[PDB]
Paper text:
Because we were unable to produce hSARM1ARM recombinantly, we used the [name] domain of Drosophila [name] (dSARM1ARM, residues 315–678), produced in E. coli, to investigate if [name] interacts directly with dSARM1ARM. Isothermal titration calorimetry (ITC) analysis showed that [name] bound to dSARM1ARM with a Kd value of 2.83 ± 0.16 μM (1:1 molar ratio). To further characterise this interaction, we determined the crystal structure of the [name]-bound dSARM1ARM (1.69 Å resolution). dSARM1ARM contains eight tandem armadillo repeats (ARM1-8) stacking into an unusually compact right-handed superhelix. The bound [name] molecule sits in the central groove of dSARM1ARM, which is mainly lined by the H3 helices from ARM1-5. The interaction is mediated by two pi-stacking interactions between the indole of W385 and the pyridine moiety of [name], and between the imidazole ring of H392 and the nitrobenzene moiety of [name]; and eight hydrogen bonds, with a buried surface area of ~910 Å2. The hydroxyl group from the side chain of Y396 and the amino groups from the side chains of the conserved R437 and K476 form hydrogen bonds with the phosphate group of [name]; the amino group from the side chain of N640 forms a hydrogen bond with the nitro group of [name]; and the imidazole rings of H392 and H473 form hydrogen bonds with the urea and ribose of [name], respectively. [name]-bound dSARM1ARM adopts a similar conformation to NMN-bound dSARM1ARM. Comparison of the two structures reveals that the NMN moiety of [name] and NMN share the same binding mode, with the key residues involved in NMN binding interacting with the analogous portions of the [name] molecule. Importantly, in the NMN-bound structure, NMN forms a hydrogen bond with the residues H599 and G600 (loop connecting ARM6 and 7), while in the [name]-bound structure, due to the extra portion of [name] (urea and nitrobenzene groups) extending to the region between the N- and C-termini of the protein, two different hydrogen bonds are formed between [name] and H392 (ARM2 H1) at the N-terminus, and N640 (ARM8 H1) at the C-terminus. Furthermore, the pi-stacking interaction between H392 and the nitrobenzene of [name] is specific to this compound.
[name] ([name]) plays a central, pro-degenerative role in programmed axon death (including Wallerian degeneration). [name] has a critical nicotinamide adenine dinucleotide (NAD) cleavage (NADase) activity, which is activated when its upstream regulator and axon survival factor nicotinamide mononucleotide adenylyltransferase 2 (NMNAT2) is depleted or inactive. Recent structural data revealed the existence of an allosteric pocket in [name] armadillo-repeat ([name]) domain which is important for the regulation of [name] activity. NMN binds to this pocket, leading to [name] activation.
Numbering used by the authors: 373 to 675
Write the structure that this text describes.
């Protein structure tokens, strides 16, 4: 009864504050009951492919990503690429969503997804005008930047990912712009990419953005990120709090300020201690940079 399960999970994620726990508990139930394995078996049957992919896309949570990686990554990447090739916009959104989440597991899994065509599929879809698809693409590239590690940055350089990112950063949609800028803020730690970023001028988009958006309202602006990111994702963003580039530090501080507000309402403020962001934030709350300092201080107060 996929149509009914997909509706339940969609409604669960959408509950403000509680949707994080509700979606996680349902998606974990799917794994423990054997339903996740059934979806992976069915996603290679042409008749059951899109319905299976539609539910997979909504349940690629932390532990389920591990399960897919261990049991059938090649099948899931294939279905996602099939979906991006389909003409229906509903399909394109699903395929790009799957790939966005498969880039949030590990360096090695990013390498496998790239090997199987996942990055090529995302870059191809960057040509679309569909906002939801483009939002998935920008998020996928931010995730790949955060999780790919050094090996995969060389592969991003060869495929000219920075080039695909800069147009997304100048997009007028705030969610596309934000996640494109987050990817860029992460990648400037790579000195070869840094040169291209400085020439682009995209980093100049940060100061107008963070001073014009209230972190709390921005969180509520898109259902997909209303509950924030996982501690494993935030752990990987912590180093940007001490980036070489002032603009990147500013964006990371804004992000942590937003996450602090969200995690306060969930009772998960302890994750910041676990990922050693408290000390990284305390340092920024004392530095001369007034923009980043204010955001980090508000984050600590929210924590
Ligand atoms: O609330 C969340 N996500 C919320 C959300 C919303 C709508 C859909 N989905 C689906 O879930 C899978 C991605 O999972 P995520 O990478 O976790 O987003 C994908 O299939 C996605 O379509 C998730 N995450 C979270 C938060 C706090 C902590 N924490 O406090 O440690 C840990 C994790
Ligand atoms: Na919310
Ligand atoms: Na914008």
């Amino acid at each position: 009864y996929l149509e009914k399960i997909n509706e339940v999970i969609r409604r669960a994620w959408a509950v403000p504050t509680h949707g994080h726990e509700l979606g996680y508990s349902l998606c974990n139930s799917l794994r423990q009951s054997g339903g996740l394995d059934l979806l992976m078996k069915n996603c290679v049957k042409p008749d059951l492919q899109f319905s299976s992919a539609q539910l997979l896309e909504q349940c690629l949570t932390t532990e389920n990503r591990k399960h897919v990686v261990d049991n059938g990554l090649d099948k899931v990447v294939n279905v996602a690429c099939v979906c991006t090739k389909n003409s229906n916009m509903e399909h394109s959104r699903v395929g790009t969503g799957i790939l966005e989440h498969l880039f949030k597991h590990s360096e090695g899994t990013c390498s496998d997804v790239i090997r199987l065509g996942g990055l090529d599929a995302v870059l191809f879809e960057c040509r679309t005008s569909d906002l939801e698809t483009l939002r998935h693409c920008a998020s996928a590239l931010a995730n790949l930047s955060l999780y790919g590690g050094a090996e995969n940055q060389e592969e991003m350089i060869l495929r000219k990912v920075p080039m695909w990112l800069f147009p997304l950063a100048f997009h007028n949609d705030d969610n596309i712009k934000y996640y494109a800028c987050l990817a860029i803020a992460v990648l400037v730690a790579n000195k070869e990419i840094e040169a291209e970023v400085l020439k682009s001028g995209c980093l100049d988009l940060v100061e107008p953005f963070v001073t014009s958006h209230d972190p709390s309202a921005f969180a509520r602006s898109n259902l997909a990120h209303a509950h924030g990111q996982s501690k494993h994702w935030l752990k990987r963003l912590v180093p940007v709090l001490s980036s070489n580039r002032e603009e990147a530090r500013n964006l990371a501080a804004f992000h942590f300020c937003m996450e602090a507000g969200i995690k306060r309402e969930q009772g998960n403020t302890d994750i910041f201690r676990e990922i050693n962001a408290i000390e990284a934030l305390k340092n920024v709350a004392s530095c001369p940079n007034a923009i980043a300092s204010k955001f980090a201080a508000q984050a600590l107060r929210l924590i």
